[PDB]
């Protein structure tokens, strides 16, 4: 197209033509009608539950407050009972603790009518507390997906991928404008990317889906178009706000042509009216673009229940230390 316009065989070129420092000294470009640049596409993630989620339902004030309240209730019950092994201060605490946690462990009942009312009230409080805790935990189990995005060609994941978990293995199609720009801007990244060269764009999506690749660097417009029509919406771009070497698609016109001003004015008028949004709604928008993160609650694994096991181990260590003393 550039040769045809320069050779006078045509007056204007309409298509996906990029604007750059070069190619402008021989042809005049109009106002771009669509943004583009160098973006990165990565596969979507889901996420799991936090290890400490088992403490989410109740705030710390609650747990300590209930501890102090249980201690006070046990002391009051012991005092009331004071008025062979009839009862003891150390056994009331054990009985109350057993009652709170579903009343599973064996306990010794008191030998006083007055203490029975206190035991019943404590049991009612414990059942209410257990029901509330279970309901809150069930509510907390609704977890949505999270987009593990990156700043884009400016974070440690791309500059120094060898100083962390296995490298991101980001790759791009060689022998193109993007490769030249990467080489001219970041020599180290270009050198490191030589081990993940992709032949074509169609196979890049398959490689990313399988797991052989974790990030594909390419033109923003093409990546957005491909992501829009994904068969499962498992691929998401980085975002329009973080794009490297931003540019736009324009219309090539003859040098010193009188139609350039009118063409730019018409394009600006189209932008102002709102026709561009309508056109992009049916020509660029894919199957799934205005979608949130699916919940798709999963099961529990060792990592999910790490907090409970850690607490059990800490309790065992404390018991051993107390026994040693």
């Amino acid at each position: 197209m550039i040769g045809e316009v320069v050779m006078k065989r045509a007056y204007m070129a309409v298509g996906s033509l990029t604007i750059n420092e070069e190619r402008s000294e021989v042809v005049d470009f109009s106002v771009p009608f669509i943004e583009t640049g160098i973006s990165v596409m990565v596969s979507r993630s889901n996420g799991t539950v936090s290890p400490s989620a088992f403490l989410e339902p109740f705030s710390a004030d609650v747990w300590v407050m209930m501890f102090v309240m249980l201690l006070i209730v046990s002391a009051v019950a012991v005092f009331v009972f004071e008025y062979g092994p009839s009862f003891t201060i150390g056994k009331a605490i054990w009985l109350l603790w057993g009652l709170v946690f579903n009343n599973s462990v064996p306990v010794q009942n008191p030998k006083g009518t007055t203490s029975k009312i206190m035991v019943s009230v404590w049991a009612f409080f414990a059942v209410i507390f257990l029901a509330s805790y279970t309901a809150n935990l069930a509510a907390f189990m609704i977890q949505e997906e999270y987009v593990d995005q990156v700043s884009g060609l400016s974070d440690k994941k791309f500059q120094r991928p060898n100083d962390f978990s296995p490298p991101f293995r980001f790759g791009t199609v060689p022998n193109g404008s993007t490769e030249r720009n990467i080489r001219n801007n970041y020599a180290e990244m270009h050198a490191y990317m030589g081990k993940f060269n992709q032949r074509g764009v169609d196979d890049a999506l398959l490689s990313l889906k399988t797991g052989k690749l974790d990030a594909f660097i390419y033109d923003a417009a093409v990546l957005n178009y491909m992501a829009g029509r994904d068969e499962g919406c498992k691929l998401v771009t980085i975002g329009s706000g973080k794009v490297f070497a931003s540019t736009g698609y324009g219309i090539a016109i003859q040098k010193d042509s009188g139609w350039k001003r009118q063409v730019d004015l018409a394009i600006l008028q189209l932008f102002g009216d709102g026709e561009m949004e309508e056109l992009e709604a049916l020509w660029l928008t894919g199957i799934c673009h205005n979608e949130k993160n699916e919940v798709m609650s999963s099961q529990l694994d060792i990592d999910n229940m790490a907090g409970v096991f850690y607490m059990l181990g800490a309790a065992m260590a404390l018991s051993l230390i107390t026994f040693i003393c």
Binding site: N20, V76, V80, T114, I117, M118, F125, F244, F271, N293
Partner: protein, 89 residues
């Protein structure tokens, strides 16, 4: 909230017939190509002090479930009188 609408860009304004339009545009294009604009963006507009994500469900606070404690306190206050009367009779 929402998606960007009315996409546009920031530019340098000048009076018509000013001998700086072509040079200014070329300088802007060169800055975009050589990564100067990226450095400027990373220097001034680049901050993640407090990010955001799907907020977790609300947690029950003291004021949200302050009824059970009051009920148990009332039970104990009644029980003290009950035991006093039982001992007195």
């Amino acid at each position: 909230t929402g998606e960007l609408f009315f996409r546009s860009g920031f530019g340098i304004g000048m009076r018509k017939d000013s001998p700086w339009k072509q040079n200014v545009s070329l300088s802007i294009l060169k800055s975009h190509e050589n990564g100067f604009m990226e450095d400027l963006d990373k220097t001034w507009v680049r901050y993640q002090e407090c990010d955001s994500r799907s907020n977790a469900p609300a947690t029950l606070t003291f004021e949200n479930m302050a009824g059970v404690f009051m009920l148990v306190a009332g039970g104990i206050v009644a029980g003290i009188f009950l035991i006093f009367i039982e001992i007195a009779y």
